[PDB]
Amino acid sequence: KVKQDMPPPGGYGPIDYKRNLPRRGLSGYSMFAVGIGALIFGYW
Amino acid sequence: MELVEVLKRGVQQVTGHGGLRGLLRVFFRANDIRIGTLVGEDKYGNKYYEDNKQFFGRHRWVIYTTEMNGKNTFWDVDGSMVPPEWHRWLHCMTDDPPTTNPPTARKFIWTNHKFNVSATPEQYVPYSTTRKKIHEWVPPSTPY
Amino acid sequence: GVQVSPSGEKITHTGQVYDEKDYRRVRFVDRQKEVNENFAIDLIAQQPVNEVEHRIIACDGGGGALGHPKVYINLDKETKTGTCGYCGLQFKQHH
Amino acid sequence: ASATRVIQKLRNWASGQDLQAKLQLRYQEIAKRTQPPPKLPVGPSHKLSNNYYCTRDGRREVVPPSIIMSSQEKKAVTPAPPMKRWELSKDQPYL
Amino acid sequence: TSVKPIFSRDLNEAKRRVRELYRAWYREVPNTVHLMQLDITVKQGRDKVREMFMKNAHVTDPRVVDLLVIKGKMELQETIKVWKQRTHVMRFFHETETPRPKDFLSKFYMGHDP
Amino acid sequence: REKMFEFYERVSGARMHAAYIRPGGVHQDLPLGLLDDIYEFSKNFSLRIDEV
Amino acid sequence: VYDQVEFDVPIGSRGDCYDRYLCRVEEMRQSLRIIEQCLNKMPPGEIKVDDA
Amino acid sequence: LHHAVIPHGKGGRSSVSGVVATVFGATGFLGRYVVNHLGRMGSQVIIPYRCDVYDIMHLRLMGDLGQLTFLEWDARDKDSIRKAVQHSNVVINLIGREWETRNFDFEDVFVNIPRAIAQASKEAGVERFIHVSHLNASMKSSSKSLRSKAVGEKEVRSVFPEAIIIRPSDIFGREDRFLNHFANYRWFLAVPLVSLGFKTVKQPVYVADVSKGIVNATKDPDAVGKTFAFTGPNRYLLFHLVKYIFGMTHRTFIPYPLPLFVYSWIGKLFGLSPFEPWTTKDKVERIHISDVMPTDLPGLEDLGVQPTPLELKSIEVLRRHRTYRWLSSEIEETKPAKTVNY
Amino acid sequence: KRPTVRPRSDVTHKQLSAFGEYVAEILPKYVQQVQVSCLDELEICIHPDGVIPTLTFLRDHTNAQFKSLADLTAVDVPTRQNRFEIVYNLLSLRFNSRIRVKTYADELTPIDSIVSVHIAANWYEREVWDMFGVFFFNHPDLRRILTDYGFEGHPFRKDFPLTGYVELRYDDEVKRVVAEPVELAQEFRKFDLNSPWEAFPAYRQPPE
Amino acid sequence: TYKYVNKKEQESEVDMKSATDNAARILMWTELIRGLGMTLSYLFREPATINYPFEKGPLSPRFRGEHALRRYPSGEERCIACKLCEAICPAQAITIEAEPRADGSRRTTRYDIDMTKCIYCGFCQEACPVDAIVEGPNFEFSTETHEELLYNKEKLLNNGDKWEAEIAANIQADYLYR
Ligand SMILES: NC(=O)C1=CN([C@@H]2O[C@H](COP(=O)(O)OP(=O)(O)OC[C@H]3O[C@@H](n4cnc5c(N)ncnc54)[C@H](OP(=O)(O)O)[C@@H]3O)[C@@H](O)[C@H]2O)C=CC1
Ligand SMILES: CCCCCCCCCCCCO[C@@H]1O[C@H](CO)[C@@H](O[C@H]2O[C@H](CO)[C@@H](O)[C@H](O)[C@H]2O)[C@H](O)[C@H]1O
Ligand code: SF4
Ligand code: SF4
Ligand SMILES: [Zn+2]
């Protein structure tokens, strides 16, 4: 019986190739709101 | 908790080489103090260890002997000191050590390995292996 | 075997050896003449002659595809052996 | 793999990815370094019959180039039909 | 025996381009010697220029003299722009090469070559 | 790249200059178990591109 | 067999160093797309032309 | 000739010249020029060395593959000297120091070591022995080194009667201790010259000519047993030479006289240096011992070498002693020195 | 269907013959021969005077648009009087086709430079001049490109020896890299490989 | 099919919600903080380094390394001086001479590989009809002189005897692919 290197029956599972850089972080208001809070408390 | 398990393995590695002398000897010779399983040893004194939980490339390693062919190799270890039976296992060209799959014996195979002899008085020196081609005339040894 | 010349240099299996007055001997000063000590001529002579029944026998050197190309040797000349032209093994007919 | 679960959370969050699923290092999923022997198949001309070489010889089907012009109304032509414009990818047209 | 000209229509119109190249090479020796910090004198450099121009003193085909002038301008440019180095300029002077004797006996003693 | 050099070596025996593609085909057939390793590498490679 | 494997060609819009960098990065992803197909569509057979 | 020494080729590196020379002292200033000339024509060269291997690296590229053989030797051990001169058809002795060390004095270097080499070369069956000495070598010499050279010549010719003796004057080159020695006086503001340098005559010779005539003696049939005087083509008063050197380096020349005994005492201080002395008493003496007139001795031209003027080659030695303002000044900007026929 | 012999196609060879006649009708002043190989590649062989007009028409004509100069190179055939065959490989992206335009030259008959047609050619014509010594008129910057500075000769000419005439080494006497006549420890061994039996009856030459 | 890498001008309108996001991106260096995060994650990954010379990089049985001359199980040389390795060598790296031996055998009196001409292509391994010349698995044989890299027959037979135990097993693991 021929024994050659071949893919398994059905084939290989899917391979990710598309860009996948996640979207993450606080909102624009939250960043500014924290920073402006830190100044105000520091000025006080 | 996990941090303690880490310190457990750390202690177990510090004390797993047989004393303080053992730990210093391995640490300053190989800069590594892992604990592998002794797979075998050779006629020269190299010891072969493995840990299949390590990632491919660190799952096999050798602690070279400290004296080979009369040379002092406590500090001067080079990769040419691994004989050919283990050279194949150590380089992952196979999967079974010579302690279980010995090489076929031959009467001409070197019994004693020899590492890189460059720079030494044993070093190879090239030369022509043929014999003289043109033979010159030899004059008579007597007057005429 | 590894004969030694009168000059003290070892003679290789091909019979080469620098003369006494050949300057080219200087390359071995403080070094060595690489010589292979297992003379294949001496090793092949040690093998016993395989005896076979038929008059024509095929030699491939052993190992099948790991040997040499398969050839056949006549065994009629019942005074000398048949020699393989590749591996140098000898054969002789049983009767 | 040997990393504690605390450092896994730290570096998954710092990267913003799930590193543990796709490690750069290789462990057990690699192939065994000693595989069983292969048994490779022959080709389509390993027949014992109906396999004359002259009927499957490519080097001999080559001929010298056709000479269209030399020293020895008609519609205008292009070197080939115009290329078709490529279509935009349906998988992901705008990366 | 009729052929397309390159630049010159006959040897006299080509020698005009030769002398103009020799002028340029002559003006540039004192700079090459100064910029490349060569260990020669200007007179010795200029003599070498003259020696190379006389190496091709037998050429008569006008097309050939066009392509020697074309090459010589390329050589001049490689030197003015310092694309060449001391090693390259100094190769003209064959300072490491022992010169083969031109007499029969010396050749005969030295080997089989003519 | 060190891992892709391993696929070059497992088919040809050289990390770079494989001399493996030849007029008429390829020199030797894939060793058994090579497509698994190429697949194992490929499933993870897009994460590497993501990090860059 | 490039006329049997499916993939997209990345194109740029400004023709500067940044678009070329994005094209190369997107080509590496498209090579990954091709490799997955080769691994499943690899057929059996000889490797050099059956003509000695 | 043995069949392995017949000369083939065209005198390139891959040719065979038929010369198998052991050069003793190849690791010095004149040594690299002797090996290069031997090596470039395709000669086997055996190079005995006592220094570190790092110091013989620049010689490795002087011969084709196989044409250079480096050997470790100790001048005290005879057996190592035999080991080197054993396979040669010529032995060239260039051993020498300009100063004395703890372990080797001028007698050792200039008498015993040359005799040890010549004695072993005669026993080994070497056809030619080339021994370098000095032009002003003489037993009635002020310089302690120059008397030993005179003795050494005679020892060499007692045990090797047919030895060829080479007597160069001061050798000047890129690594010499001659033009680089005076160019370095600038570090001391002024130039102390005994009698202001007007009584001393010098006829310096270019190193490549010395080395090119030494190699030409390895093959000249009419050289066995002769003594040669290798000298430049021009004699200069020391003052004019030292003045010319500073003209070539464009440094400020401020010469003043200094009596030989005050100058000799300074050289003793610099000789206390544990390293390589900047100067010594013997080096100060030799600088002012005047070159002998050439009277009946074959010179460079009898070995097919045309002496190179000090003017053609000074700038390659002295350009590195200039400042940025003068690096590019050409040879012509310097007025040539004045020669003397006595 | 033969699993060892290259598929032959059919339409492309017919198309390139039609365009080859097209080009020859339009540029009869320059075209000397038109052929299409069994690989299906169109070749136009022109008189060297026709280079610039021929590549200009092929670039700007609407039913051609061979806008890319894939490469430009020479072949040295010493038996010919005009020993240098100049080859232009052009690419049409509009029609997804290729075309080869060939002319010739000798040692003393320079070709016009097409730098006015294809800027791509600028360095290609420097390489032909350097390697084969074929001069080009009107080149903006004709000078060596691939050989060492002050290298004498044109090393891709068939009569130029493989190892050349000079070699370099460092000379410690003069303290620089010097050039000297070539001597090899081992000579390049020439192998006579040609079989004395004819392999292709289709290319046999008449014994006239 | 084609895709756009750097096209996105399907212009949207800048909401106050979105403008404040662009500003926080610019003022707070948010994307530059993301990059700092990626290198921080790598700090706590295990390094890919191996502990050479005590650990070795993986190799396959086909690995083309140092040359060697093999023998038959009886100790007879396999090489029959056919000179096919010499005719194929792309680098003209092999030099061979031969003559009848004392027993009449066809054997080489010379066999050199100038390992500084060799390109380690392995073509000689393919051309040899009797598996006499092989490229062993050794790769750690750097020397301190050029001349030591000109291998004559003795040196190559010595490499054969040195490495045979390992060469034979690599051929055993690969000859069926040949
Ligand atoms: N101006 C000149 O250069 C002149 C030179 N000469 C003579 O020419 C010869 C060489 O001149 P130069 O090249 O300047 O001399 P160097 O100062 O260059 O030293 C020459 C060699 O002598 C070797 N040497 C010295 N002492 C010993 C020792 N005890 N054992 C072994 N080797 C030793 C050195 O080897 P290492 O470096 O390892 O010590 C060095 O290679 C000498 O005889 C010198 O007197 C004659 C006239 C003028
Ligand atoms: C009262 C004060 C009077 C002034 C002092 C009298 C002058 C005495 C000093 C003269 C100059 C000394 O200058 C010294 O010259 C010697 C002779 O070459 C050099 O000597 C050394 O130089 C380099 C150093 O690697 C070597 O290559 C060279 O072969 C070696 O001789 C020194 O590098 C230099 O420092
Ligand atoms: S590996 Fe290639 S280059 Fe090296 S000896 Fe064999 S055929 Fe020649
Ligand atoms: S090594 Fe093999 S190919 Fe080379 S000569 Fe010997 S038998 Fe022939
Ligand atoms: Zn047999």
Q: Say which of D57, D60, D65 has its CB closest to residue I35.
A: D65
Residue among J1, J2, J5, J10 with most chain G CBs within 10 A, to mutate: J5
- Total number of residues shown for chain J: 178
Measured CA to CA, the distance from residue H60 to residue J54 in angstroms comes to 34
- Are C and I close enough to touch, i.e. 3+ CB pairs under 8 angstroms? no
Q: What is the C-alpha R_g of chain D?
A: 31
Please state the φ and ψ torsions of residue H113, each to the nearest 5 degrees: -60, -50
- The type of residue at H315 is I
Measured CA to CA, the distance from residue C92 to residue C75 in angstroms comes to 6
Structure tokens at H26: 């190849």
Ligand 2 atom at minimal distance to the Cα of residue H270: 8
Q: Cβ(J84) to ligand 4 under 6 A?
A: yes
Ligand sitting nearest the alpha carbon of H26 = 1
Determine which helix (DSSP H) or strand (DSSP E) holds I56, and give its type and residue range: helix I51-60
**Touching chains, F (3+ CB pairs < 8 A):** A, D, G, J
Q: Say which of A5, A7, A16 has its CB closest to residue F46.
A: A16
Ligand 3 atom at minimal distance to the Cα of residue J122: 1
Helix axes E62-80, E11-35, angle to 10 degrees: 20
Measured CA to CA, the distance from residue D20 to residue D84 in angstroms comes to 46
B85 in Cβ contact with B99 (< 8 Å): no
Beta-carbon-side half-sphere exposure of residue E16 (alpha carbons within 13 Å)? 6
Min CA distance, J33 vs chain B (Å)?
Answer: 28
Task: Give the total number of structural domains in chain E.
Answer: 1
What pairs with residue C4 in β-bridges? C10
Nearest to D32 by CA among J143, B110, B93: B93
Cis ω before J53 (30° cut-off from 0): yes
Helix (H, G, I), strand (E, B) or coil at G52: coil
- Measured over the CA atoms of residue D55, residue D57, residue D62 and residue D63, the dihedral's sign is negative
Per-residue CA distances from B38 to B79, B99, H212, I197, J50 (Å): 19, 11, 66, 65, 19
Measured CA to CA, the distance from residue J86 to residue J97 in angstroms comes to 11
What pairs with residue J111 in β-bridges? J96
I40 in Cβ contact with I12 (< 8 Å): yes
Beta-carbon-side half-sphere exposure of residue E5 (alpha carbons within 13 Å)? 10
CA of J86 from ligand 3 middle (Å) equals: 9
Task: State how far Cα I141 lies from the chain centre.
Answer: 20
Structure tokens at I168: 């370099």
Ligand sitting nearest the alpha carbon of J127 = 4
G44/A4 Cβ within 8 A? yes
Number of H helices, E strands in chain A: 1, 0
Q: How far apart are the first and last CA of chain B?
A: 109
Measured CA to CA, the distance from residue I126 to residue H297 in angstroms comes to 60
Nearest to B122 by CA among E110, C31, H123, D44: C31
Structure tokens at E80: 């003015």
B19 CB-contact burial (10 Å; exposed 0-12 / middle 13-18 / buried 19+): exposed
Sequence-distant (≥ 6) Cβ neighbours of residue J107 within 8 angstroms: C40, J77, J79, J80, J81, J98, J99, J101
Measured CA to CA, the distance from residue D33 to residue I157 in angstroms comes to 51
Q: Which residue has the tokens 């069956």?
A: H125
Q: Which residue has the tokens 């690899």?
A: G42
E50 in Cβ contact with H340 (< 8 Å): no
Structure tokens at H159: 């045990």
What pairs with residue H167 in β-bridges? H229
C30/H86 Cβ within 8 A? no
Measured CA to CA, the distance from residue G43 to residue D37 in angstroms comes to 19
User: DSSP class of residue E68?
Assistant: H
Measured CA to CA, the distance from residue B92 to residue B90 in angstroms comes to 6
Measured CA to CA, the distance from residue D66 to residue D44 in angstroms comes to 32
I105 in Cβ contact with I154 (< 8 Å): no
Q: Cβ(H27) to ligand 2 under 6 A?
A: no
Nearest to H39 by CA among H57, H21, H55: H21
H85 CB-contact burial (10 Å; exposed 0-12 / middle 13-18 / buried 19+): buried
Q: How far apart are the first and last CA of chain D?
A: 33
Structure tokens at H305: 């070498």
Determine which helix (DSSP H) or strand (DSSP E) holds H255, and give its type and residue range: strand H255-257
Nearest to E65 by CA among E5, E1, E2, E114: E5
CA of H181 from ligand 2 middle (Å) equals: 5
Q: Checking phi first, is residue H176 left (phi over 0); if not, alpha (psi -120 to 50) or beta?
A: beta
Ligand 4 atom at minimal distance to the Cα of residue J127: 3
Helix (H, G, I), strand (E, B) or coil at A41: helix
Q: What angle do CA I52, I54, I56 make, to 5 degrees?
A: 65
Helix (H, G, I), strand (E, B) or coil at E45: helix
3-state helix, strand and coil shares in percent for chain E, rounded to the nearest 5: 65, 0, 35
Nearest to H297 by CA among H142, H168, H118: H168
Q: Which residue has the tokens 């895709």?
A: J3
Pocket test for ligand 2, best of H55, H177, H282 (most atoms within 8 A of CB): H177
Min CA distance, J163 vs chain F (Å)?
Answer: 17
Per-residue three-class SS string for H264-309? HHHHHHHCCCCCCCCCCHHHHHHHHCCCCCCCCCCCCHHHCCCCCC
Helix (H, G, I), strand (E, B) or coil at F49: helix
F42/A15 Cβ within 8 A? yes
Measured CA to CA, the distance from residue I65 to residue B120 in angstroms comes to 69
Q: Which residues of J touch D26 (CB under 8 A)?
A: none
User: DSSP class of residue H332?
Assistant: G
Sequence-distant (≥ 6) Cβ neighbours of residue J48 within 8 angstroms: B57, D24, D25, F2
Measured CA to CA, the distance from residue I22 to residue D77 in angstroms comes to 7
I132 in Cβ contact with I74 (< 8 Å): yes
CA of J113 from ligand 3 middle (Å) equals: 8
J68 in Cβ contact with J115 (< 8 Å): no
H222 CB-contact burial (10 Å; exposed 0-12 / middle 13-18 / buried 19+): exposed
Structure tokens at H113: 């070591």
Measured CA to CA, the distance from residue I9 to residue J21 in angstroms comes to 59
- Output b/e per residue, I93-132; b: 16+ Cβ within 10 A: ebbebbbbbbbbbebbbbbbbbbebbeebbebbbbbbbbb
Per-residue CA distances from H232 to C7, C19, H301, H313, H341 (Å): 47, 44, 11, 12, 13
Structure tokens at H303: 């070995």
G25 in Cβ contact with G13 (< 8 Å): no
- The type of residue at I152 is E
Measured CA to CA, the distance from residue D40 to residue D32 in angstroms comes to 20
Min CA distance, H73 vs chain B (Å)?
Answer: 15
- The type of residue at J93 is A
Please state the φ and ψ torsions of residue H49, each to the nearest 5 degrees: -140, 140
Per-residue CA distances from J32 to A34, F46, H242, J29, J37 (Å): 19, 22, 67, 5, 9
Domain limits, chain C: 1-94
Sequence-distant (≥ 6) Cβ neighbours of residue H134 within 8 angstroms: H146, H149, H167, H168
Q: Say which of C34, C68, C88 has its CB closest to residue J158.
A: C34
Task: State how far Cα I26 lies from the chain centre.
Answer: 24
Determine contact: F10 vs chain J, CB below 8 A: yes
Measured CA to CA, the distance from residue I27 to residue I54 in angstroms comes to 7
Per-residue CA distances from I131 to I72, I75, J38, J50 (Å): 13, 10, 51, 48
Nearest to I130 by CA among I141, I144, I118: I144
- Are G and A close enough to touch, i.e. 3+ CB pairs under 8 angstroms? yes
Helix (H, G, I), strand (E, B) or coil at J68: strand
Helix axes J16-27, J30-43, angle to 10 degrees: 50
Measured CA to CA, the distance from residue I66 to residue D64 in angstroms comes to 26
A29/J20 Cβ within 8 A? yes
Measured CA to CA, the distance from residue C84 to residue B79 in angstroms comes to 41
Nearest to H7 by CA among B134, E109, I185: E109
Measured CA to CA, the distance from residue E30 to residue B40 in angstroms comes to 76
B89 in Cβ contact with J170 (< 8 Å): no
Query: H helices of chain H, where?
Result: 29-40, 78-85, 106-107, 113-124, 144-159, 179-183, 207-217, 238-249, 260-270, 281-288, 310-318
Q: Checking phi first, is residue J100 left (phi over 0); if not, alpha (psi -120 to 50) or beta?
A: beta
- Strands B37-41 and B47-50 come out as antiparallel
Is G11 annotated to bind ligand?
no
Nearest to E33 by CA among E25, E21, E24, E41: E41
Q: Closest residue (by CA) to atom 6 of ligand 3?
A: J124
Residue among J41, J118, J177, J178 with most chain F CBs within 10 A, to mutate: J177
Structure tokens at B10: 């750390």
Min CA distance, J138 vs chain B (Å)?
Answer: 9
What pairs with residue D94 in β-bridges? J4
Measured CA to CA, the distance from residue J65 to residue J137 in angstroms comes to 5
Task: State how far Cα B92 lies from the chain centre.
Answer: 15
- Are A and H close enough to touch, i.e. 3+ CB pairs under 8 angstroms? no
Q: Say which of B58, B113, B126 has its CB closest to residue J152.
A: B126
Determine contact: D38 vs chain F, CB below 8 A: yes
Measured CA to CA, the distance from residue A28 to residue E47 in angstroms comes to 80
Please state the φ and ψ torsions of residue H90, each to the nearest 5 degrees: -160, 145
Ligand 4 atom at minimal distance to the Cα of residue J78: 7
D77 CB-contact burial (10 Å; exposed 0-12 / middle 13-18 / buried 19+): middle
Determine which helix (DSSP H) or strand (DSSP E) holds H46, and give its type and residue range: strand H44-49
Ligand sitting nearest the alpha carbon of H277 = 2
Chain H 212-231, residues with CB within 8 Å of chain B CB atoms: none
What pairs with residue B60 in β-bridges? B50
Beta-carbon-side half-sphere exposure of residue H40 (alpha carbons within 13 Å)? 22
Q: Cβ(H97) to ligand 1 under 6 A?
A: yes
- The type of residue at E78 is E
Q: What is the resolution of this structure in A?
A: 2.8
Measured CA to CA, the distance from residue B21 to residue B9 in angstroms comes to 20
Helix (H, G, I), strand (E, B) or coil at I35: strand
I152 CB-contact burial (10 Å; exposed 0-12 / middle 13-18 / buried 19+): exposed
Sequence-distant (≥ 6) Cβ neighbours of residue J112 within 8 angstroms: J94, J95, J96, J150, J151, J152, J153
Per-residue CA distances from B56 to J43, J100, J137 (Å): 20, 51, 20
Domain residue limits at E81: 1-114
Q: Which residue has the tokens 């492309």?
A: I12
For residue H295, the tally of other CB atoms under 10 A from its CB is 6
Structure tokens at D27: 């462990």
Min CA distance, G1 vs chain F (Å)?
Answer: 13
Sequence-distant (≥ 6) Cβ neighbours of residue I88 within 8 angstroms: I55, I69, I72, I100, I101, I102, I114
- Strands C82-83 and C71-74 come out as unpaired
Q: Which residues of C touch H83 (CB under 8 A)?
A: 29-30
Please state the φ and ψ torsions of residue E62, each to the nearest 5 degrees: -60, -35
Helix (H, G, I), strand (E, B) or coil at C4: strand
What pairs with residue I75 in β-bridges? I85
